[PDB]
Amino acid sequence: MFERIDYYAGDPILGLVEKFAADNNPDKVNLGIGIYYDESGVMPVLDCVKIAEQRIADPISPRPYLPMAGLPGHRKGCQELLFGKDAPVLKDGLVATIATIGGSGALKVGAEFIHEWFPQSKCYVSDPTWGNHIAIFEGCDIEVGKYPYYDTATGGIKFDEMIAFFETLNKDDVLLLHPCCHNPTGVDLTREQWDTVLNVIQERELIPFMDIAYQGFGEDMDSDAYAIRKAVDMGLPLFVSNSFSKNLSLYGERVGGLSVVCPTVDETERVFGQLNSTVRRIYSSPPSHGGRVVDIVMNDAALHEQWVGEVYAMRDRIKSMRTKLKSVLEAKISGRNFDYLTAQNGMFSFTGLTPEQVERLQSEFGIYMISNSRMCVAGLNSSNIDYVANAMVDVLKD
Amino acid sequence: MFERIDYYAGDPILGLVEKFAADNNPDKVNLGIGIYYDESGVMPVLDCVKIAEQRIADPISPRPYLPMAGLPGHRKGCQELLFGKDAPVLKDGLVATIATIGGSGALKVGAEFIHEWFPQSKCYVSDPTWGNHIAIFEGCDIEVGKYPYYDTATGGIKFDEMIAFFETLNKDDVLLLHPCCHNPTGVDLTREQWDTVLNVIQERELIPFMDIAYQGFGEDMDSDAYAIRKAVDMGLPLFVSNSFSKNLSLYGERVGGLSVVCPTVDETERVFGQLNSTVRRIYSSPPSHGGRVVDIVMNDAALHEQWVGEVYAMRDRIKSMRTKLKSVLEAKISGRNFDYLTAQNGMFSFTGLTPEQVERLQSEFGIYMISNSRMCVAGLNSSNIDYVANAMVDVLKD
Numbered sequence A, B: 001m002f003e004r005i006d007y008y009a010g011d012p013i014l015g016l017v018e019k020f021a022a023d024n025n026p027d028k029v030n031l032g033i034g035i036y037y038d039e040s041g042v043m044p045v046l047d048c049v050k051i052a053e054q055r056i057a058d059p060i061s062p063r064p065y066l067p068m069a070g071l072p073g074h075r076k077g078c079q080e081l082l083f084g085k086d087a088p089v090l091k092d093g094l095v096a097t098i099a100t101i102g103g104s105g106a107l108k109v110g111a112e113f114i115h116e117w118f119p120q121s122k123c124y125v126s127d128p129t130w131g132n133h134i135a136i137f138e139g140c141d142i143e144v145g146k147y148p149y150y151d152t153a154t155g156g157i158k159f160d161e162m163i164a165f166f167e168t169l170n171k172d173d174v175l176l177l178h179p180c181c182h183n184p185t186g187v188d189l190t191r192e193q194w195d196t197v198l199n200v201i202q203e204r205e206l207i208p209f210m211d212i213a214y215q216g217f218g219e220d221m222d223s224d225a226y227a228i229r230k231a232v233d234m235g236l237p238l239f240v241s242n243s244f245s246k247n248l249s250l251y252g253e254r255v256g257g258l259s260v261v262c263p264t265v266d267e268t269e270r271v272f273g274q275l276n277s278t279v280r281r282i283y284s285s286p287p288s289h290g291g292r293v294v295d296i297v298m299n300d301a302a303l304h305e306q307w308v309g310e311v312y313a314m315r316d317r318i319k320s321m322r323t324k325l326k327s328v329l330e331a332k333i334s335g336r337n338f339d340y341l342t343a344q345n346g347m348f349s350f351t352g353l354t355p356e357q358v359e360r361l362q363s364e365f366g367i368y369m370i371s372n373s374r375m376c377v378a379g380l381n382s383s384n385i386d387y388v389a390n391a392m393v394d395v396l397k398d
């Protein structure tokens, strides 16, 4: 029956957790996973989630289908979070929004929608990007290309070539952009740079599709969304897929949102029904439990304020692990430039180690990273920071 | 930007919930939606489901990603329920099975797999069927048609027209089949009819896609799986999408499974592999909460054993509303025969009212059904059967 079917590409990450788990080094450190661990190196349960979940368990309720669009409040919660409490665009009702099965599901729905209505659009992703970007858009039959981003020569954005590359693009072509906290690089645009990029997206009539998955891991909630809020202010046909996976420690509960910012209330009505019809032919309606958590935390001002504070705690704990790392490297490689480590943001960092050095960390010291040089800065804490740091020193000098 | 996008007509039944919800009448009844209600007309929370979520809340635990395929346990419960505890097919390792976002997510993943791997196959569904079948398979770019099924003359199957239609189909054409409890009609194939279908499905080399959402609601768990197991014993390449929404009363939590039966271990690994790949590029991995409920109930023998009692309870209550409705009607319109109301199985019945008769039931009585005469029997209970039964006796001598 099925011998024509090829074996899958495979899970690059589980083959990586499997290798680490197997790794015999007692001092082993996993900087390879895409996940927040606290300073005790465990996945945190947030205090506000914990309260929300207590509410859900009292009383245990009947469990109807959620609307295809997800809970009214969940929907609002993504919107306020992304566009600002009581944003003009929200008052005028110019945004169509759905709850979604994570960021992933929001990517999937946006992509499927853009495939149905703009079957002529190619999509570009950044180079590099999270590989699931590509598999999701390719999964819909969109042509995926990449645009020039990480300058491997400098640790910086190759901004010029990037811009000029947008100049070559067609009406309605889609740009998958990271508003903050780049994955895999941690390398972010500046505001004045976002301002440039956006005028280009306006001038060539392109679609910006922003995938924001680390809001608050960056600078702060409001600031992290700058690109989004600018794009709105500029009349761009904005798509926004957003995720609560990392910033609620709710990865498994699959909570996310897709937003589409339209010109007029009537176009909003059109897009919205279509987002609904798309959800319907995929999975029907989103999971209740996750939905209630997002609903409760975002909309209960006290819990929201609590939430935000836990989020900044993580943002800050990362920043310290970041600065604590650079100080040990500069102390011991007197010549070198390590600024990029603290100039980066979010949960990831391109360390600028060569594939070979990354190999040597693993084989000599039990330290797992990805070979493009990506490390998960959250994997680091005080019980492992010296061990990693000195291990990096050994590999870097040689 | 989006002037060219169509209005989405909407999920046809939910706007009808709005119109009944709108209806002013004291004696309003809603028999249109597909939800199981208890003897008090309320959506229940199953006693075993209660226990499970008590466990999930204690302690509230971190929420990591489930594997792409869902919980190994969830996956097992699906498999055991459908093919039988420690079944030959399960021991041999020949069934590739993933947790899914509802049955709907099972149909979707299945459909995509068929689309990626058997791109010339057409899909056939029952005339009529649950609307979403078509919407889903059409949404993956498969061409959907109908096979002759329900007979308006008799309220029976058009069995001859059906096999005859089957005979005209090509190798690897897909048949969407309800193994029991057909939606919308309630009208089921007998065992010998089943063997006969499967025979034709064999001789013409077709693919059976068995979509089973009401296991336990027809006769009992095993009997309801008869076509599935038989096809297995037949060595056909079966796909089985199964849903826990109705029989765990967990609609909102989105818990289903997809199983594909293959000839060799090697084939299982390829196919199963494609399935995780397929999940990855739609939503990454399914919801933890629902997934824990299915895992827990399914594999705790006491809860599992409890759970089944609860289904059979539910099976019984519907069978009683079924017999009660016929008693009232058979007693009061002497000549014509209603055996179909109890010849039918599961949640739905095609009542045979014309749209003229159906409208009038809403217009004069406030009793809400689909225009095609589909009623949901579980919407009935001892407090309104007596009301509804008469509105029908009435609308019928018009």
Ligand SMILES: Cc1[nH+]cc(COP(=O)(O)O)c(/C=N/[C@@H](CC(=O)O)C(=O)O)c1O
Pocket (backbone or CB within 6 Å): A283, A284, B033, B034, B035, B101, B102, B103, B104, B105, B130, B183, B211, B212, B213, B242, B243, B244, B245, B251, B255, B256
């Ligand atoms: C035959 C059938 N198959 C699959 C599904 C998918 O259900 P899920 O909730 O994904 O497990 C349903 C749902 N039927 C409900 C209709 C609906 O979802 O709108 C119903 O009871 O009508 C079916 O009736």
Ligand SMILES: *Cc1c(COP(=O)(O)O)cnc(C)c1O
Pocket (backbone or CB within 6 Å): A034, A101, A102, A103, A104, A105, A130, A183, A211, A212, A213, A243, A244, A245, A251, A254, A255, A256, B283, B284
């Ligand atoms: C982790 C990640 C997501 C995750 O979305 P989920 O589907 O909620 O896990 C989405 N987008 C990006 C860029 C990510 O890094």
Ligand SMILES: [Mg+2]
Pocket (backbone or CB within 6 Å): A139, A140, A141, B139, B140, B141
């Ligand atoms: Mg497609």
